[PDB]
């Protein structure tokens, strides 16, 4: 099916000590595949997905080149928005990038994305167009101008619609046994009594990837989690009078299931 | 791979 | 846009020679140039942020001043005679596959 | 690692269509660039391309092509004013440095 490559950046002042930390990321759909932080060793992007260790020094010399570049441009970014918002380098101050493009199961172009962050909050965005920006409030409206002025929306539409969508087709290529394999959800239902009369029945979707779920009662849905080995967990549970076990039943939507699963108790 | 257009705010 | 302190200039072999370059497009980045008839240009110096600095291509008989965001001095510490050329400054934001832009180029001339 | 263009002066008939090329040897590189420089002035960036194919600005065509390492200019109508150096560059990745063309001459006749 469907298919994103996305980066996330996060760049973190703080004061009194040094330049500030910054952290890239970089996921094919729900699976990371490189990683930077400023504050290690390395001071190189570092593969975390085994395929993507097949791309030659080049590849990781321009990957370290553009992803230092990054770093250096939301350390200046901490700053100017310090300066538009007329606040002191006392303070701690986040500033967040992500960006990636979609594909479908033909692989074809669906969607890109660009979005920005100052402090958690939606700072300047690209439209989905990606020709012109949404602006919050307006200091965002300084930089939209800048961006503007600089053809920023052209640079990144051809990114989007361009590099993102070749490079991600080549990922999923020279990855295939992991990135287009589909881990189908082991499921099961536990049962558990309360100060009567009542019973919790507990539906369970284990160890499945990719991790878009859907668990469907006839409430609580905590959240798809990670359980550290590249699968994901979810669990939803409706309290039920007691005694009346069969009129309830589960169902589990999952990529890797020919047909929806249906769970009885 | 990475991409162009990130610039300053 | 961006200005260079001068246009033409004639100096004698020893003397040391300030070419200054500004810029108000709130750019980071800084480059000076020499263009030369058969080469094409070639980088001296550049700069990604102020007090920062780092050789070209060909940075002999060349030092560089970067203490504003707006200022980057080219300095020919003893002025020979294959310096002289047209001396182009350059600027861009920072980012990535970002473009620079020149001033009006500065021709300088070194006689013995 | 360098970017290489076909040789000057190229001679091009006023109302003809004036083609310079450019070849560049990474790859992995993103943003190209055309400067026109006249005679004892600076460059002027006069055009910008960054996906493949075809991007037009008044009698400007410019086409990308990344398989081949490949950027071309065209001038279409070629008109007395546009005689100059075309310089071909391409984005350096490091510290914002571009790598430059060693230019090519246009003689427009009239």
């Known amino acids: 099916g469907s298919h994103s490559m996305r980066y996330f950046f996060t760049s973190v002042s703080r004061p009194g000590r040094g330049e500030p930390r910054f952290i890239a990321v970089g996921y094919v759909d729900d699976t990371q595949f490189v990683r930077f932080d400023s504050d290690a060793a390395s001071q190189r992007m570092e593969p975390r997905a085994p395929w993507i260790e097949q791309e030659g020094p080049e590849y990781w010399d321009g990957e370290t080149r553009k992803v230092k570049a990054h770093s250096q441009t939301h350390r200046v970014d901490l700053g100017t928005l310090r300066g538009y918002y007329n606040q002191s380098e006392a303070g701690s101050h986040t500033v967040q990038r992500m960006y990636g493009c979609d594909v479908g199961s033909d692989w074809r172009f669906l969607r890109g994305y660009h979005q920005y962050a100052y402090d958690g909050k939606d700072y300047i965005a690209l439209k989905e167009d990606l020709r012109s920006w949404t602006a919050a409030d307006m200091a965002a409206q300084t930089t939209k101008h800048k961006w503007e002025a600089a053809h920023v929306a052209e640079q990144l539409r051809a990114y989007l619609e361009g590099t993102c969508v070749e490079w991600l087709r080549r990922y999923l290529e020279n990855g295939k046994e992991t990135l287009q394999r589909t881990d189908a959800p082991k499921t099961h239902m536990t049962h558990h009594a309360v100060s009567d009369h009542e019973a919790t029945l507990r539906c369970w979707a284990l160890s499945f990837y990719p991790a878009e779920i859907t668990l469907t009662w006839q409430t609580e849905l905590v959240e798809t989690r990670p359980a550290g080995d590249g699968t994901f967990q979810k669990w939803a549970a409706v309290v039920v009078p007691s005694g009346q076990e069969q009129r309830y039943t589960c169902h589990v939507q999952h990529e890797g299931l020919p047909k929806p699963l249906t769970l009885r108790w | 791979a990475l991409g162009i257009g990130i610039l300053t705010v | 846009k961006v200005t260079q302190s001068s246009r033409y200039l004639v100096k004698r072999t020893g003397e040391k020679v300030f070419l200054e370059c500004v810029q108000d497009?709130?750019?980071?980045?800084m480059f000076w140039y020499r263009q030369d008839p058969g080469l094409g240009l070639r980088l001296i110096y550049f700069?990604?942020?102020?007090?920062?600095?780092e050789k070209g291509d060909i940075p002999e008989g060349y030092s560089v001043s970067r203490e504003k965001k707006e200022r980057f001095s080219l300095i020919l510490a003893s002025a020979s005679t294959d310096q002289t050329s047209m001396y182009l400054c350059?600027?861009?934001?920072?980012?990535?596959?970002?473009?620079?832009?020149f001033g009006p180029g500065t021709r300088l001339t070194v006689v013995e | 690692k360098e970017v290489e263009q076909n040789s000057g002066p190229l001679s091009v008939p006023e109302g003809a269509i004036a083609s310079l090329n450019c070849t560049y040897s990474?790859?992995?590189?993103?943003?190209f660039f055309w400067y026109r420089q006249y005679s004892g002035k600076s460059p002027e960036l006069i055009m910008s391309?960054?996906?493949?194919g075809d991007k037009e600005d008044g009698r400007f065509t410019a086409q990308l092509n990344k398989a081949s390492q490949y950027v071309s200019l065209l001038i279409r109508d070629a008109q007395p004013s546009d005689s100059a150096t075309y310089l071909c560059?391409?984005?350096?990745?490091?510290?914002?440095?571009?790598?430059f063309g060693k230019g090519t001459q246009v003689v427009v006749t009239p």
């Open positions: 350059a600027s861009s934001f920072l980012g990535t596959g970002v473009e620079q832009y």
């Open positions: 497009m709130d750019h980071e980045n």
């Open positions: 700069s990604y942020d102020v007090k920062m600095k």
């Open positions: 990474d790859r992995g590189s993103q943003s």
């Open positions: 391309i960054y996906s493949n």
């Open positions: 560059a391409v984005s350096g990745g490091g510290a914002d440095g571009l790598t």
